[PDB]
Inverse folding.
């Protein structure tokens, strides 16, 4: 399953409402079946002077972004062992997870809490929270992320932000389910 | 002084060089002399995912931005003293200089170091450095600013960025002198 012009049309106001609720830029991405990077297909930017402003069609790293890790978290142990064996783990920053054990631990916690969290792993001062959108085969065919600076996505708000992105991704999975 | 598209085209390379050298978004703003405001009229954004991305036509506060304070620094003490007697100043953040004493201090230091510095005074987590551009009558009409997050514009880079923007502004000034009215 996937999107879809009428689906993107449903998705867009969900993204709009999420920007307004979170105060940050929101992205929707799909997965590149390899390199397992997430490609941005839609976005609603916030109006803060400083903000996340990746371009539409921009690609986020597999192991090192909210959207990338959200997708990656849905794969089996052996699937991820094979992808890490193949692609390696480019260090964007000193926080990037470059150890398989550390990455796999973070993926485990991502499944548990319902959102991925990029904590300055792609770029210094940048945080993102993401959740996958699922089809009828429980395949993640898209992910929404909320992306913004550490000065606003503060530690005391991470859980709250995670809740917001869960709810947005859920609304899209439901919307897809409805249109069928 | 007067900016046209053609003049913007002519100085664009200076702005693009500054964005590349600083790694941050570069803005050029003009002073509205009627309404005393700083209006962004061009911009070269950096390629960082997180970056300053004000729109063209955006306004920056006189007392609380790099471009605004660069303009204020050019005014006589009497001129600042008066228009600040007016006249309350909006507090964008806890760092916004809303005390006339404190603002005037900062403007003196601006004149001395050659560049203004907005240290989270417009928005939390945002720094800018700016310097004025002068027309053929040596009148300030524009300002160029480097604007970016405190994650990258760190204390050890403030002086160096100040230097970059002074040099850039002087290059725009020279280029404008050579192409006035284009």
């Amino acid at each position: 399953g996937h999107m879809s012009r009428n689906l993107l049309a449903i998705v867009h106001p969900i993204l709009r409402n999420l920007m307004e609720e979170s105060g940050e830029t929101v992205n929707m991405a799909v997965l590149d079946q390899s390199d397992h990077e997430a490609i941005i297909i839609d976005q609603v930017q916030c109006t803060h002077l400083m903000r996340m402003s990746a371009p539409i069609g921009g690609k986020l790293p597999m192991h090192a972004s909210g959207a990338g890790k959200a997708f990656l978290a849905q794969l089996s142990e052996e699937q991820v062992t094979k992808l890490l064996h193949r692609k390696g783990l480019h260090a964007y920053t000193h926080a990037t997870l470059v150890s398989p054990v550390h990455l796999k631990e973070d993926l485990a916690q991502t499944r548990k809490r319902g959102y991925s969290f990029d904590d300055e792993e792609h770029a210094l001062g940048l945080r993102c929270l993401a959740a996958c959108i699922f089809d009828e085969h429980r395949e993640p065919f898209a992910a929404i992320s909320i992306s913004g600076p550490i000065s606003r996505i503060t530690d005391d708000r991470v859980t709250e932000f995670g809740a917001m992105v869960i709810k947005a991704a859920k609304e899209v999975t439901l919307a897809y389910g409805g249109m069928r």
